[model samples]
Target: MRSIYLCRHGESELNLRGRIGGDSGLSARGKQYAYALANFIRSQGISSLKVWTSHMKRTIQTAEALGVPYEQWKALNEIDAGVCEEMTYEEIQEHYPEEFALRDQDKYRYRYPKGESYEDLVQRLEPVIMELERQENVLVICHQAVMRCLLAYFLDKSSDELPYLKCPLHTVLKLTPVAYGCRVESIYLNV
Candidate 1:
């Protein structure tokens, strides 16, 4: 059966700083994860794998380490935090207290000012999902929110739960299409 591999970009500079959204390059550890990922894929002998990534630098850089050509998708980019972009959770709470509280109440639908909501992300990911349904041996290197949308669909998760799915960095989620549903296996590369 065909398999779909999903992974978040390696740790970014912003990730090390505990910031949210930013187009930063990878940290030293992130670079290490990139090489580790490349080696892991090589070990698996997935020669026909088609790699996909976001247009963002982090994802693109991560894909580069794989030493395989990849296609970039703007739709795979990270969630837009708008005014909250590059801000840490504490900073968001301090600057936009009401907004922060509102998100806490319903994170799935809370659209950041001038940004997007998890609901919006789901809509944006529809085309990607459709393409994935028809593809085989594909590796998607993307963001946390985008990964949640894809994982939710394949795992039969509820809308409420989609926003909270845990997609850690440098980990590969291998999804195989089975007769009943998709079977998932996780490979965590220690970097």
Candidate 2:
């Protein structure tokens, strides 16, 4: 049976600063995770693994040490914050109070100005999902939002739960397909 390994990118500079979304590079801690991931992959006896990542720098950097060729898929990118791309949630709440409240009210349906909703993300990932249905031993290194969407499909989660899945950084989420659903396991790298 084939398994999929899903992992969030390492800690980014923007993440350290409490910012929402940006194409920021990895921080010192993130780099440590990168190397740590390399060691973990080696230790896990992971060979013949295919790698997939978002076009974002952080995701790409996290997979740099895998020593295997990886493919970049725009569909694997993070949720767009639109006009508030680099703003923190607190900043958004302070500046765009109505929008903030609106999102809280219906996060699955609320689209940030010029951005997308969790519903939109689910639709966008349809193609990726189709491909994933037939893949084998693939490692997906992507962002939190994207991971949640993919996880929701395999774990039988509802749309209401999609926007709030707990996806922590520097952790490898392994999923094995079963008859009715999939089994999930998370391995944290102490980076």
**lDDT (Cα, tens digit) per residue for candidate 1, span 22-87:** 899999999999999888888888759999999999999999998889999999998899999999
lDDT of 1: 0.92
Per-model TM values vs. the true structure: 0.98, 0.96
Go through the candidates in order and give each one's C-alpha lDDT: 0.92, 0.89
The most accurate candidate by TM-score is 1
Stretches of candidate 2 off by over 4 Å are none
Scored against the true structure, residue 43 in model 1 reaches a CA lDDT of: 88
State residue 180's C-alpha deviation in candidate 2, in Å: 2.8
Per-residue C-alpha lDDT of model 2 across residues 57-160, encoded as one tens digit per residue: 99999888677789999999899989899999888988888998888888888899999889999999998989888788888989999999999999989988
